[PDB]
Ligand binder design. Structure first.
Ligand code: NA
Ligand code: NA
Ligand code: NA
Lengths: 258, 258, 258
């Protein structure tokens, strides 16, 4: 498939890479980019050879905002009738893990894109913010929901009311990102993390991702019941027997389940 | 209005300041102070010229506890019949943002007051704790609820079972506060943050605050739906058009919505 | 009672210690150990002289995993019919506080054991991970539920998909543990913390623990109502009068409630 706003590749075995490529717009999220990222991610999710997906931007910007030239003329009814941002919501239904590799600006919709991914690997140059209020709006893709759950009320209120950014260091300290690495090492780290995930059991990876997502949907008691049911069900798989037998036999597992 | 336990002022444009002023009691929260803070905050919320509110104590204490001389004689039925602490609950219904500027002791009800605010700016001298257990009670104003949500179970259990305090540094590290600054810079930082918020769109500020509060009331899926509806509705406002147009025209926005 | 996988003691006044003792297995959690820890904890909970419980392993391992030799042959129906891990769930019903004192490896079920406790005191040597995916399974004792609630999605996804460990330092930074101390000081710190808790009001300790646990079961509004009811009820106790009177009289309280 040919894309106009992104570049896709398979840079290492088992990993699909989606690189945002609107450099004139600092990778601002527009409607085309939304559809193209969703399409690419769905193709990677359907590809048996791929175990994990990486989303990244440029050295300068993961994504600096949603595209404001596109949003300025929007009305409430048009936003609702077009189901605006629903493509990004659909991205949360991809079953394989998605690793955001964030360099430079991840602002507004770009911060929200990083937060909707499963892991975030941040360059030391990464800056995370929700400056929607400065434009007379509020976040619409989880900047008030996923951010608050990750970093707490006091930091979420500061970001979303003042427009300030967090540095990568601060973001890691308060739970927004998985890891920080030097900027020159960002893509290598993200590809290595993604390949490690891709070498793991496929059904176990899906189960982990599903269960962590479910942690935000239920009270703890019900989440524990959900996780316990998922755990029992893993014992139905070939990969469970192989993984545990390999451990006990001090050898590498050969996972085969789809 | 004349107050007996607080001092109110408008120190910079767009900002209302509430300073707790019971120095003999280290600003312990009594019934009078509760009613006076609520009254002052409601007046600032109704004042069109004000965009944000700051609550602060003295250099020595934001508030060291609820007033124990007042609580010692309390019975369960009197506490329930008087709706004790309901004024502080009402403070959560103020629509404009509230910034807590915390120096020195914020203990017990004082820590809870900081946590019920939207942002917390802490002096490096700030100390946060919930020593209710040492008095034979437990927190009654969110010291087990807002604290746990901010800092996690292990730190909340430590504070509320052992009576220890967190330093400002520790509090920031685990998500209890928005920012730390040197003690001499605390009021300047809080007033600057509050004025920045007051320069933002009024309906967008209310929407941000409401949506972040809603993050603690719903599972993520339903919170995302709530936030998406709020986002669509912002496109109904003059401030959205002005904010986005100003961005695109590389100029300062002139927000006008009430 | 004689135990085969643990050693129990009363090392300081008011504290019951449970030491995991399967050194050949690095304290891996098997069925026997589960039942023995539950039994010991229930005995300490019923002992009027005990105010807090400490669970610890060896210098090398708090617990390195669930016992894989035992799980390798498990089927989904046998896991469900045996109510596997239900003993650990029952441990959450112990009313007195439980302090995990973690040195060295706390992996898999061992990390989950630390997270199900109320406080975690970590040696600087502590390592926390959920490497279940490497065995073809997922966590079944809260490694996707309690971990996510403590540290956030990005870190929980990293741990549970990549199998990496957090250092004690990292774990404290993101909210997984209460305190870090040098390895040589771990048991002293944990016993001192536990004795401090044991010197507090018994009903107030139970109420604190219950309310913090309830923070994960309800939306904030309902959690605040729960906590407010619990607070009113504390004024029914002798310990509340004694604790507050002692404060006001600048003396040590003599708590007596059971
Ligand atoms: Na099996
Ligand atoms: Na519009
Ligand atoms: Na009483």
């Amino acid at each position: 498939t040919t894309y106009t706003t992104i570049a896709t590749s398979r840079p290492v075995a088992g990993v699909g890479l989606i690189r945002l490529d609107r450099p004139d717009a600092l990778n601002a999220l527009n409607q085309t980019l939304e559809a193209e990222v969703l399409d690419a991610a769905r193709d990677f999710d359907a590809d048996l050879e791929i175990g994990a997906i990486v989303v990244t931007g440029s050295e300068r910007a993961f994504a600096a905002g949603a595209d404001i030239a596109e949003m300025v003329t929007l009305t409430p009814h048009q936003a609702r009738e077009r189901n605006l941002l629903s493509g990004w919501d659909s991205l949360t239904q991809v079953r394989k893990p998605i690793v955001a590799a964030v360099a430079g600006y991840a602002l507004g919709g770009g911060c929200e894109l990083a937060m909707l991914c499963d892991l975030v690997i941040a360059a030391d140059t990464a800056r995370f913010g929700q400056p929607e209020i400065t434009l007379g709006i509020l976040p619409g893709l989880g900047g008030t929901q996923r951010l608050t759950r990750a970093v707490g009320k006091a930091k979420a209120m500061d970001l979303c009311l003042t427009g300030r950014s967090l540095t990568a260091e601060e973001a890691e300290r308060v739970g927004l990102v998985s890891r920080i690495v030097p900027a020159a090492d960002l893509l290598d780290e993200a590809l290595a993390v993604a390949q490690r995930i891709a070498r793991m059991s496929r059904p176990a990876g899906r189960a982990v991702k599903d269960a962590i997502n479910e942690a935000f949907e239920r009270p703890l008691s019900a989440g524990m019941r959900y996780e316990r049911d998922a755990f029992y069900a893993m014992f139905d798989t070939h990969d469970q027997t192989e993984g545990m037998t390999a451990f006990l036999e001090k050898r590498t597992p050969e996972f085969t389940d789809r």
